[PDB]
């Protein structure tokens, strides 16, 4: 609906992450266990956060590429509401993750990486998947060229298929206007939503979200 | 040299993984911490297994898609010799992993998934990466068809580019002959290499590998 504010926790230990979750909980809608924290600490991270923050949407960012039935179940059982699955997973793996999600009252989000196509995106939607994470393209980022027409058009196409995007990649309040008319579930950021000025920046993000949704 | 025997540990807790590693150590060359174990237990799985088995090649199977510099350094610091990176990782991420690997004297292995191409495979080789993991085609598995000619053709092309493949997906002694003449670093299997019949299975695989390599 109105895009939510999501923090990606990418700490390399649970103690630190637990202290950040505990800090930002009051002004963040979605807390994500990032893949760096997932691989540092394992599903204990997801558990501990789920118990600390029973009322937040909790994401486990595994970027699952294979072994989906098993991984999905582990993450949901540990307490995740949403899990991420790589666009590069075979469609049978994606379907296996979505089957577990539908059984456990969770959702799948496709992390868009690799040589992905619009046909792939339609396959996701055909499984009933309605979420995908769109990252500002790595080429653009490296060239310092910002958000390109190409990206915004791809996002609009994804949107026209029924995918609700989570938008990420240096997102700042001045960029928000760029995505008006794109179906957007969340804007994601890491620690620029954390610490002492995280609050201010979040109010600032929301202020701009309200204008365009 | 000859293809080695690798076990992929996919236990969902560390205690069971440690018991399996302990039981197969003397007849398996490479121990891999599979993504299932890595997500279950985190890097404590890698450092525990590195401590229990200081003389084995240890793999951390992360299928890295992003955050490569950070994840790679974590894995190597934990004791991994080889780590896996997804074919879907952007080339700049792949390069960032390979840089950390070179600094820490480890290696990168490309997990072949997604809409991958021979151009992509040449890009990996250009970075000095010479290992990739080739899984039996999922389409073929689902259809009840074995190893297809299209798979074997693709593996021979990858080999010709200079990639040493690790081959996996229901590998049994009976199929070993199929891969003659492919540059093969390892064959990877899971719990079939463990338990009461694991040792025999491994001997049966080595007996076939010896017929066809080097």
Short mmCIF file of C-alpha atoms in Angstrom, two decimals:
data_model
loop_
_atom_site.label_atom_id
_atom_site.label_comp_id
_atom_site.label_asym_id
_atom_site.label_seq_id
_atom_site.Cartn_x
_atom_site.Cartn_y
_atom_site.Cartn_z
CA UNK A 1 0.00 0.00 0.00
CA UNK A 2 1.93 3.02 1.29
CA UNK A 3 5.56 1.75 0.98
CA UNK A 4 7.01 0.81 4.38
CA UNK A 5 10.45 1.51 5.89
CA UNK A 6 12.75 -1.50 6.16
CA UNK A 7 16.17 -1.87 7.78
CA UNK A 8 18.64 -4.52 6.55
CA UNK A 9 20.76 -5.75 9.54
CA UNK A 10 24.17 -6.70 8.15
CA UNK A 11 26.11 -6.95 11.51
CA UNK A 12 28.63 -9.80 11.88
CA UNK A 13 27.48 -10.71 15.41
CA UNK A 14 24.05 -11.18 17.15
CA UNK A 15 24.91 -8.99 20.21
CA UNK A 16 25.45 -5.88 18.00
CA UNK A 17 22.45 -6.63 15.77
CA UNK A 18 20.26 -7.23 18.83
CA UNK A 19 21.28 -3.79 20.13
CA UNK A 20 20.42 -2.15 16.76
CA UNK A 21 17.03 -3.95 16.35
CA UNK A 22 16.34 -2.74 19.90
CA UNK A 23 17.21 0.85 18.86
CA UNK A 24 15.27 1.19 15.59
CA UNK A 25 12.22 -0.94 16.47
CA UNK A 26 10.05 2.11 17.26
CA UNK A 27 10.45 3.81 13.82
CA UNK A 28 11.04 0.92 11.38
CA UNK A 29 8.31 -1.24 9.89
CA UNK A 30 10.39 -4.19 8.64
CA UNK A 31 13.55 -5.74 10.19
CA UNK A 32 15.64 -7.87 7.89
CA UNK A 33 18.23 -10.38 8.94
CA UNK A 34 20.74 -9.79 6.17
CA UNK A 35 22.67 -12.62 4.60
CA UNK A 36 25.91 -11.50 6.31
CA UNK A 37 24.24 -11.81 9.76
CA UNK A 38 22.47 -15.05 8.66
CA UNK A 39 25.82 -16.64 7.73
CA UNK A 40 27.67 -15.19 10.82
CA UNK A 41 25.14 -16.45 13.34
CA UNK A 42 22.67 -18.82 11.63
CA UNK A 43 18.97 -19.14 12.47
CA UNK A 44 19.67 -18.16 16.14
CA UNK A 45 19.73 -14.52 14.81
CA UNK A 46 16.27 -14.86 13.38
CA UNK A 47 14.90 -16.49 16.57
CA UNK A 48 16.37 -13.97 18.91
CA UNK A 49 15.05 -11.04 16.88
CA UNK A 50 11.67 -12.59 16.46
CA UNK A 51 11.39 -12.93 20.21
CA UNK A 52 12.72 -9.44 20.83
CA UNK A 53 10.32 -7.87 18.32
CA UNK A 54 7.17 -9.94 18.19
CA UNK A 55 5.26 -7.20 16.38
CA UNK A 56 7.59 -6.37 13.47
CA UNK A 57 7.71 -7.92 10.00
CA UNK A 58 10.84 -10.02 10.02
CA UNK A 59 12.82 -10.97 6.93
CA UNK A 60 15.42 -13.70 6.51
CA UNK A 61 17.65 -12.79 3.56
CA UNK A 62 19.08 -16.10 2.36
CA UNK A 63 18.99 -15.43 -1.35
CA UNK A 64 18.10 -19.08 -1.65
CA UNK A 65 19.45 -20.65 -4.83
CA UNK A 66 18.86 -24.32 -4.01
CA UNK A 67 17.55 -26.58 -1.21
CA UNK A 68 14.50 -24.42 -0.95
CA UNK A 69 11.95 -26.75 0.81
CA UNK A 70 14.48 -27.20 3.68
CA UNK A 71 15.81 -23.65 3.93
CA UNK A 72 12.39 -22.03 3.72
CA UNK A 73 11.08 -24.22 6.50
CA UNK A 74 14.12 -23.54 8.71
CA UNK A 75 13.71 -19.76 8.29
CA UNK A 76 9.96 -19.64 8.85
CA UNK A 77 10.23 -22.01 11.82
CA UNK A 78 12.91 -19.76 13.27
CA UNK A 79 10.36 -16.89 13.08
CA UNK A 80 10.76 -15.14 9.69
CA UNK A 81 7.70 -13.65 8.02
CA UNK A 82 9.36 -13.16 4.61
CA UNK A 83 12.32 -14.90 3.02
CA UNK A 84 14.38 -13.98 -0.01
CA UNK A 85 14.97 -16.35 -2.88
CA UNK A 86 17.45 -15.67 -5.71
CA UNK A 87 16.08 -15.07 -9.21
CA UNK A 88 18.71 -17.64 -10.20
CA UNK A 89 16.98 -20.48 -8.28
CA UNK A 90 15.41 -22.99 -10.65
CA UNK A 91 11.63 -22.43 -10.85
CA UNK A 92 11.07 -25.76 -9.05
CA UNK A 93 13.09 -24.45 -6.05
CA UNK A 94 11.12 -21.21 -6.12
CA UNK A 95 7.88 -23.19 -6.16
CA UNK A 96 9.09 -25.34 -3.25
CA UNK A 97 9.83 -22.19 -1.20
CA UNK A 98 6.41 -20.78 -2.08
CA UNK A 99 4.71 -24.02 -1.06
CA UNK A 100 6.34 -23.83 2.39
CA UNK A 101 5.44 -20.08 2.64
CA UNK A 102 1.78 -20.72 1.91
CA UNK A 103 1.75 -23.51 4.55
CA UNK A 104 3.42 -21.35 7.23
CA UNK A 105 1.71 -18.02 6.70
CA UNK A 106 4.84 -16.49 5.11
CA UNK A 107 5.86 -14.80 1.85
CA UNK A 108 8.61 -15.21 -0.71
CA UNK A 109 10.53 -12.28 -2.13
CA UNK A 110 12.60 -12.72 -5.27
CA UNK A 111 16.01 -11.08 -5.09
CA UNK A 112 16.66 -9.87 -8.64
CA UNK A 113 20.23 -10.83 -9.65
CA UNK A 114 21.82 -12.52 -12.65
CA UNK A 115 20.70 -12.69 -16.29
CA UNK A 116 17.01 -12.50 -15.29
CA UNK A 117 14.22 -11.88 -17.82
CA UNK A 118 10.65 -10.65 -17.89
CA UNK A 119 9.59 -14.22 -18.70
CA UNK A 120 11.16 -15.28 -15.38
CA UNK A 121 9.26 -12.53 -13.63
CA UNK A 122 5.95 -13.79 -15.08
CA UNK A 123 6.85 -17.30 -13.81
CA UNK A 124 7.24 -15.86 -10.32
CA UNK A 125 3.86 -14.14 -10.51
CA UNK A 126 2.29 -17.35 -11.87
CA UNK A 127 3.38 -19.10 -8.61
CA UNK A 128 1.45 -16.39 -6.72
CA UNK A 129 4.67 -14.58 -5.70
CA UNK A 130 3.97 -10.81 -5.50
CA UNK A 131 7.24 -9.43 -4.08
CA UNK A 132 10.69 -8.84 -5.60
CA UNK A 133 13.72 -6.82 -4.39
CA UNK A 134 14.97 -4.43 -7.12
CA UNK A 135 18.60 -3.25 -6.54
CA UNK A 136 19.91 -0.08 -8.31
CA UNK A 137 21.98 -1.65 -11.03
CA UNK A 138 25.58 -2.47 -10.13
CA UNK A 139 26.94 -0.97 -13.39
CA UNK A 140 25.24 2.33 -12.69
CA UNK A 141 26.43 2.36 -9.14
CA UNK A 142 30.06 1.67 -10.27
CA UNK A 143 29.90 4.34 -13.04
CA UNK A 144 28.41 6.76 -10.54
CA UNK A 145 25.44 7.34 -12.91
CA UNK A 146 22.57 7.00 -10.39
CA UNK A 147 19.09 5.58 -11.28
CA UNK A 148 18.78 5.13 -15.03
CA UNK A 149 15.73 5.18 -17.31
CA UNK A 150 16.44 1.56 -17.95
CA UNK A 151 16.00 0.73 -14.26
CA UNK A 152 12.86 2.79 -13.82
CA UNK A 153 11.27 1.26 -16.94
CA UNK A 154 12.12 -2.28 -15.76
CA UNK A 155 10.59 -1.49 -12.40
CA UNK A 156 7.45 -0.16 -14.11
CA UNK A 157 7.24 -3.36 -16.19
CA UNK A 158 7.66 -5.50 -13.08
CA UNK A 159 4.98 -3.42 -11.47
CA UNK A 160 2.62 -3.92 -14.41
CA UNK A 161 2.89 -7.70 -13.89
CA UNK A 162 1.63 -7.41 -10.30
CA UNK A 163 5.01 -7.44 -8.54
CA UNK A 164 5.24 -5.06 -5.54
CA UNK A 165 8.82 -3.95 -5.40
CA UNK A 166 11.08 -3.37 -2.43
CA UNK A 167 13.47 -0.65 -3.61
CA UNK A 168 17.06 -0.43 -2.46
CA UNK A 169 20.49 0.97 -3.35
CA UNK A 170 21.59 4.14 -1.57
CA UNK A 171 17.98 5.16 -1.20
CA UNK A 172 17.74 8.66 0.20
CA UNK A 173 14.73 11.06 0.66
CA UNK A 174 15.61 13.09 -2.49
CA UNK A 175 15.38 9.97 -4.65
CA UNK A 176 11.86 8.90 -3.52
CA UNK A 177 10.06 11.07 -6.11
CA UNK A 178 11.69 8.97 -8.87
CA UNK A 179 9.49 5.96 -8.07
CA UNK A 180 6.00 7.54 -8.07
CA UNK A 181 3.49 5.20 -9.76
CA UNK A 182 5.61 2.09 -9.09
CA UNK A 183 3.88 -0.47 -6.86
CA UNK A 184 6.29 -0.48 -3.88
CA UNK A 185 6.05 -2.63 -0.75
CA UNK A 186 9.11 -1.11 0.98
CA UNK A 187 12.16 1.05 0.68
CA UNK A 188 15.16 -0.75 2.21
CA UNK A 189 18.21 0.77 3.94
CA UNK A 190 20.90 -0.45 6.35
CA UNK A 191 22.57 1.58 9.09
CA UNK A 192 21.62 5.06 7.73
CA UNK A 193 18.38 4.15 9.48
CA UNK A 194 20.42 3.14 12.53
CA UNK A 195 22.21 4.93 15.33
CA UNK A 196 21.53 8.48 16.38
CA UNK A 197 20.33 10.12 13.09
CA UNK A 198 18.35 7.10 11.84
CA UNK A 199 15.15 8.48 13.24
CA UNK A 200 15.43 11.77 11.42
CA UNK A 201 16.26 10.15 8.09
CA UNK A 202 13.22 7.79 8.46
CA UNK A 203 10.79 10.70 9.15
CA UNK A 204 12.36 12.31 6.13
CA UNK A 205 11.80 9.15 4.01
CA UNK A 206 8.22 8.87 5.14
CA UNK A 207 7.59 12.54 4.53
CA UNK A 208 8.39 11.97 0.87
CA UNK A 209 6.57 8.62 0.67
CA UNK A 210 3.32 10.27 1.77
CA UNK A 211 3.55 12.69 -1.10
CA UNK A 212 3.64 10.00 -3.78
CA UNK A 213 1.53 7.15 -2.31
CA UNK B 1 45.35 -35.13 -10.83
CA UNK B 2 42.51 -37.66 -10.21
CA UNK B 3 39.03 -36.50 -9.20
CA UNK B 4 38.69 -36.36 -5.39
CA UNK B 5 35.72 -37.47 -3.23
CA UNK B 6 33.76 -34.69 -1.55
CA UNK B 7 30.94 -34.87 1.00
CA UNK B 8 28.35 -32.09 1.21
CA UNK B 9 27.17 -31.82 4.84
CA UNK B 10 23.49 -30.80 4.88
CA UNK B 11 22.61 -31.66 8.50
CA UNK B 12 20.45 -29.01 10.21
CA UNK B 13 22.41 -28.96 13.47
CA UNK B 14 26.12 -28.91 14.27
CA UNK B 15 26.18 -31.94 16.59
CA UNK B 16 24.98 -34.24 13.81
CA UNK B 17 27.29 -32.60 11.24
CA UNK B 18 30.24 -33.13 13.57
CA UNK B 19 29.35 -36.82 14.02
CA UNK B 20 29.02 -37.34 10.25
CA UNK B 21 32.37 -35.53 9.50
CA UNK B 22 34.01 -37.64 12.18
CA UNK B 23 32.74 -40.85 10.62
CA UNK B 24 33.61 -40.11 6.98
CA UNK B 25 36.92 -38.18 7.52
CA UNK B 26 39.26 -41.08 6.84
CA UNK B 27 37.77 -41.84 3.39
CA UNK B 28 36.60 -38.48 2.07
CA UNK B 29 39.03 -35.88 0.67
CA UNK B 30 36.93 -32.76 0.90
CA UNK B 31 34.45 -31.74 3.52
CA UNK B 32 31.85 -29.17 2.53
CA UNK B 33 29.71 -27.15 4.82
CA UNK B 34 26.53 -27.06 2.74
CA UNK B 35 24.30 -23.96 2.68
CA UNK B 36 21.75 -25.77 4.91
CA UNK B 37 24.31 -26.27 7.66
CA UNK B 38 25.85 -22.79 7.12
CA UNK B 39 22.42 -21.12 7.58
CA UNK B 40 21.49 -23.45 10.47
CA UNK B 41 24.66 -22.82 12.52
CA UNK B 42 26.59 -20.00 10.87
CA UNK B 43 30.40 -19.79 10.73
CA UNK B 44 30.72 -21.75 14.04
CA UNK B 45 30.07 -24.79 11.76
CA UNK B 46 33.10 -23.91 9.59
CA UNK B 47 35.50 -23.18 12.45
CA UNK B 48 34.35 -26.23 14.44
CA UNK B 49 34.91 -28.48 11.44
CA UNK B 50 38.21 -26.75 10.60
CA UNK B 51 39.40 -27.58 14.11
CA UNK B 52 38.23 -31.24 14.03
CA UNK B 53 39.79 -31.88 10.62
CA UNK B 54 42.85 -29.72 10.12
CA UNK B 55 44.21 -31.78 7.19
CA UNK B 56 41.11 -31.82 4.97
CA UNK B 57 40.12 -29.38 2.25
CA UNK B 58 37.20 -27.56 3.78
CA UNK B 59 34.50 -25.85 1.69
CA UNK B 60 31.99 -23.22 2.75
CA UNK B 61 28.98 -23.37 0.44
CA UNK B 62 27.47 -19.89 0.60
CA UNK B 63 26.41 -19.54 -3.04
CA UNK B 64 27.39 -15.85 -2.63
CA UNK B 65 25.21 -13.56 -4.71
CA UNK B 66 26.16 -10.17 -3.11
CA UNK B 67 28.20 -8.74 -0.22
CA UNK B 68 31.11 -10.76 -1.53
CA UNK B 69 34.11 -9.03 0.03
CA UNK B 70 32.52 -9.32 3.50
CA UNK B 71 31.15 -12.87 3.23
CA UNK B 72 34.33 -14.26 1.61
CA UNK B 73 36.55 -12.82 4.32
CA UNK B 74 34.24 -14.23 7.01
CA UNK B 75 34.45 -17.72 5.47
CA UNK B 76 38.18 -17.79 5.01
CA UNK B 77 38.83 -16.36 8.49
CA UNK B 78 36.63 -19.15 9.86
CA UNK B 79 38.91 -21.74 8.17
CA UNK B 80 37.43 -22.41 4.72
CA UNK B 81 39.88 -23.24 1.95
CA UNK B 82 37.27 -22.95 -0.86
CA UNK B 83 34.04 -21.01 -0.98
CA UNK B 84 31.18 -21.05 -3.49
CA UNK B 85 29.86 -17.99 -5.33
CA UNK B 86 26.65 -18.02 -7.38
CA UNK B 87 26.93 -17.65 -11.17
CA UNK B 88 24.24 -14.98 -10.69
CA UNK B 89 26.57 -12.79 -8.63
CA UNK B 90 27.54 -9.66 -10.61
CA UNK B 91 31.07 -9.94 -12.01
CA UNK B 92 32.26 -7.10 -9.67
CA UNK B 93 31.12 -9.24 -6.68
CA UNK B 94 32.88 -12.25 -8.17
CA UNK B 95 36.04 -10.19 -8.57
CA UNK B 96 35.74 -8.91 -4.95
CA UNK B 97 35.53 -12.53 -3.71
CA UNK B 98 38.50 -13.61 -5.80
CA UNK B 99 40.54 -10.70 -4.40
CA UNK B 100 39.87 -11.70 -0.78
CA UNK B 101 40.60 -15.33 -1.80
CA UNK B 102 43.98 -14.37 -3.28
CA UNK B 103 44.92 -12.35 -0.21
CA UNK B 104 43.94 -15.22 2.12
CA UNK B 105 45.27 -18.09 0.00
CA UNK B 106 41.86 -19.67 -0.64
CA UNK B 107 39.91 -20.42 -3.83
CA UNK B 108 36.59 -19.50 -5.37
CA UNK B 109 34.26 -21.97 -6.99
CA UNK B 110 31.37 -20.89 -9.16
CA UNK B 111 27.98 -22.56 -8.41
CA UNK B 112 26.30 -22.85 -11.81
CA UNK B 113 22.68 -21.78 -11.55
CA UNK B 114 20.34 -19.41 -13.38
CA UNK B 115 20.34 -18.15 -16.96
CA UNK B 116 24.12 -18.67 -17.20
CA UNK B 117 26.16 -18.44 -20.43
CA UNK B 118 29.53 -19.51 -21.84
CA UNK B 119 30.40 -15.78 -21.96
CA UNK B 120 29.84 -15.68 -18.23
CA UNK B 121 32.03 -18.76 -17.86
CA UNK B 122 34.81 -17.05 -19.83
CA UNK B 123 34.48 -13.99 -17.59
CA UNK B 124 35.15 -16.25 -14.53
CA UNK B 125 38.19 -17.78 -16.15
CA UNK B 126 39.50 -14.23 -17.03
CA UNK B 127 39.43 -13.46 -13.32
CA UNK B 128 41.70 -16.47 -12.71
CA UNK B 129 38.85 -18.58 -11.26
CA UNK B 130 39.21 -22.16 -12.52
CA UNK B 131 36.63 -24.11 -10.42
CA UNK B 132 32.91 -24.51 -11.00
CA UNK B 133 30.22 -26.79 -9.62
CA UNK B 134 28.03 -28.44 -12.26
CA UNK B 135 24.72 -29.89 -11.03
CA UNK B 136 22.75 -32.43 -13.04
CA UNK B 137 20.04 -30.53 -14.88
CA UNK B 138 17.02 -30.03 -12.64
CA UNK B 139 14.68 -30.33 -15.67
CA UNK B 140 16.15 -33.75 -16.36
CA UNK B 141 15.85 -34.90 -12.72
CA UNK B 142 12.24 -33.88 -12.48
CA UNK B 143 11.48 -35.79 -15.73
CA UNK B 144 13.18 -38.98 -14.49
CA UNK B 145 15.82 -38.66 -17.20
CA UNK B 146 19.47 -39.11 -16.22
CA UNK B 147 22.52 -37.22 -17.41
CA UNK B 148 21.77 -35.88 -20.81
CA UNK B 149 24.01 -35.27 -23.82
CA UNK B 150 23.27 -31.54 -23.58
CA UNK B 151 24.68 -31.62 -19.98
CA UNK B 152 27.74 -33.59 -20.98
CA UNK B 153 28.25 -31.25 -23.97
CA UNK B 154 28.11 -28.19 -21.75
CA UNK B 155 30.56 -29.76 -19.30
CA UNK B 156 33.03 -30.53 -22.09
CA UNK B 157 32.80 -26.93 -23.28
CA UNK B 158 33.46 -25.61 -19.71
CA UNK B 159 36.42 -28.01 -19.50
CA UNK B 160 37.79 -26.67 -22.81
CA UNK B 161 37.68 -23.15 -21.39
CA UNK B 162 40.03 -24.40 -18.62
CA UNK B 163 37.40 -24.94 -15.85
CA UNK B 164 37.92 -27.92 -13.51
CA UNK B 165 34.44 -29.11 -12.66
CA UNK B 166 33.10 -30.56 -9.48
CA UNK B 167 30.26 -32.80 -10.51
CA UNK B 168 27.18 -33.54 -8.45
CA UNK B 169 23.55 -34.67 -8.59
CA UNK B 170 22.83 -38.31 -7.65
CA UNK B 171 26.35 -39.40 -8.52
CA UNK B 172 26.69 -43.21 -8.23
CA UNK B 173 29.59 -45.53 -9.17
CA UNK B 174 27.60 -46.63 -12.24
CA UNK B 175 27.55 -43.18 -13.81
CA UNK B 176 31.23 -42.34 -13.28
CA UNK B 177 32.16 -43.54 -16.78
CA UNK B 178 29.98 -40.85 -18.31
CA UNK B 179 32.38 -38.12 -17.42
CA UNK B 180 35.57 -39.55 -18.98
CA UNK B 181 37.70 -36.77 -20.42
CA UNK B 182 36.08 -33.94 -18.47
CA UNK B 183 38.53 -31.97 -16.29
CA UNK B 184 37.12 -32.94 -12.93
CA UNK B 185 38.37 -31.69 -9.51
CA UNK B 186 35.81 -33.67 -7.41
CA UNK B 187 32.62 -35.66 -7.37
CA UNK B 188 30.31 -34.48 -4.60
CA UNK B 189 27.76 -36.57 -2.82
CA UNK B 190 25.75 -36.16 0.42
CA UNK B 191 24.55 -38.69 3.04
CA UNK B 192 25.23 -41.65 0.68
CA UNK B 193 28.88 -41.15 1.74
CA UNK B 194 27.91 -41.37 5.43
CA UNK B 195 26.39 -44.03 7.70
CA UNK B 196 27.05 -47.76 7.62
CA UNK B 197 27.44 -48.03 3.79
CA UNK B 198 29.32 -44.75 3.17
CA UNK B 199 32.78 -46.26 3.19
CA UNK B 200 31.86 -48.92 0.64
CA UNK B 201 30.22 -46.32 -1.58
CA UNK B 202 33.38 -44.18 -1.55
CA UNK B 203 35.56 -47.24 -2.41
CA UNK B 204 33.16 -48.09 -5.21
CA UNK B 205 33.42 -44.51 -6.56
CA UNK B 206 37.23 -44.48 -6.34
CA UNK B 207 37.31 -47.82 -8.17
CA UNK B 208 35.50 -46.18 -11.08
CA UNK B 209 37.45 -42.94 -11.03
CA UNK B 210 40.66 -44.99 -11.31
CA UNK B 211 39.44 -46.67 -14.49
CA UNK B 212 38.98 -43.31 -16.27
CA UNK B 213 41.56 -40.90 -14.84
CA UNK B 214 44.18 -39.52 -15.34
#
